[PDB]
Design a protein around this ligand. Structure first.
Ligand SMILES: [Ca+2]
Length: 279
C-alpha cells in the first residue's frame, strides 16, 4: 500500500532517504495487534480512529481527553490518515490530567493496570504500550516500566525534551524498555531531544501532524511524538510476524537506517526507525 502526500514522519519511516512524501506499508497495517496509549486519554469518537479506539481506564473524574496530547499520540500510532499502524486496536489509559500532569503513583498504577488488562483483550498479534511522558529519575517508575515489559508488552517511552542525558529521567532511563529520541525532517536530532547511551532508537518528532480534540488536527513537536511512531512500527512488525514483544526494540534497532542523523553526541546511537518495506 502507499499513502501519497503523507505526513513527513510516516514517509520518513518507510524510506532510506529524507525528503520523500509517500508512506509505503504492508496492507496488514497492524491488524490483530493492540496498543495502549497511557496519557491524557483519547477522543475515541474522532472519525480518524474509525471505531478502533476505546478508553479502558481513567484515574480522574472523567475519561475524556480535555488536553489533546493523548489523542495526538494515539493518532500517530493508529489513525487512518496520520497513523503508522492503520488497523491496530487502540486502548486509552488516562493517567495524566487535562493539564498534562500526573503523580508518579498514578502513572505506576496505570502501568500495572495494562500488565493485567491485556490478559482480558483479544490481541492475537501482540500488545504494545506507548508512554509519551516522564519526569525526574525514580527507581519505582523504572521498575514499573520493567514489569510491564516483562509481562509481555512492548514498552516504548519518550526520551524527554531537555536536550540532556536521559539517564536522569524516568521511565526513559529504564534500560529494558525502548527509549525513543526525536529527529526532524532534515535528519537532525531535534533541538530539544534528550540523548545518551540509554536511547535505543530515534523517530520523527519535530512538526508532527496528527489528530486533536474537537475532531480536529494539529502539528506539534516532542519526543512524545517520536514515541508513537516506534510504538506503531512495533505493532506493525508484530502483525507481520517479524518480531515479538520481547525483542521488537532490538529488531527495530537492527533494521534501522544507520548513520543518517546529524547532531548526535558521541555515545548516542545513530539509528532511525525504518520499516524496510519493499513492494
Ligand atoms: Ca533499552
Amino acid at each position: 500500500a502507499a499513502q501519497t502526500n503523507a505526513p513527513w514522519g510516516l514517509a520518513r519511516i518507510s524510506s532510506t532517504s529524507p525528503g520523500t512524501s509517500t508512506y509505503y506499508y504492508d496492507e496488514s497495517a497492524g491488524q490483530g495487534s493492540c496498543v495502549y496509549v497511557i496519557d491524557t486519554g483519547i477522543e475515541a469518537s474522532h472519525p480518524e480512529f474509525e471505531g478502533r479506539a476505546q478508553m479502558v481506564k481513567t484515574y480522574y473524574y472523567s475519561s475524556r481527553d480535555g488536553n489533546g496530547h493523548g489523542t495526538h499520540c494515539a493518532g500517530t500510532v493508529g489513525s487512518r490518515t496520520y497513523g503508522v499502524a492503520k488497523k491496530t486496536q487502540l486502548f486509552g489509559v488516562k493517567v495524566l490530567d487535562d493539564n498534562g500532569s500526573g503523580q508518579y503513583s498514578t502513572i505506576i498504577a496505570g502501568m500495572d493496570f495494562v500488565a493485567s488488562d491485556k490478559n482480558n483483550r483479544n490481541c492475537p498479534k501482540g500488545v504494545v504500550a506507548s508512554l509519551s511522558l516522564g519526569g525526574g529519575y525514580s527507581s519505582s517508575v523504572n521498575s514499573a516500566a520493567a514489569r510491564l515489559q516483562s509481562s509481555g508488552v512492548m514498552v516504548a517511552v519518550a526520551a524527554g525534551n531537555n536536550n540532556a542525558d536521559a539517564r536522569n529521567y524516568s521511565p526513559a532511563s529504564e534500560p529494558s524498555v525502548c527509549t525513543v529520541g526525536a529527529s526532524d525532517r532534515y535528519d537532525r536530532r531535534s533541538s530539544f531531544s534528550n540523548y545518551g547511551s540509554v536511547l535505543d532508537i530515534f523517530g520523527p518528532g519535530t512538526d508532527i501532524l496528527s489528530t486533536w480534540i474537537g475532531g480536529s488536527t494539529r502539528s506539534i513537536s516532542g519526543t512524545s511524538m517520536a514515541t508513537p511512531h516506534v510504538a506503531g512500527l512495533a505493532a506493525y512488525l508484530m502483525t507481520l510476524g517479524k518480531t515479538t514483544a520481547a525483542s521488537a526494540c532490538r529488531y527495530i534497532a537492527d533494521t534501522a537506517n544507520k548513520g543518517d542523523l546529524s547532531n548526535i553526541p558521541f555515545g548516542t546511537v545513530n539509528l532511525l526507525a525504518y520499516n524496510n518495506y519493499q513492494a
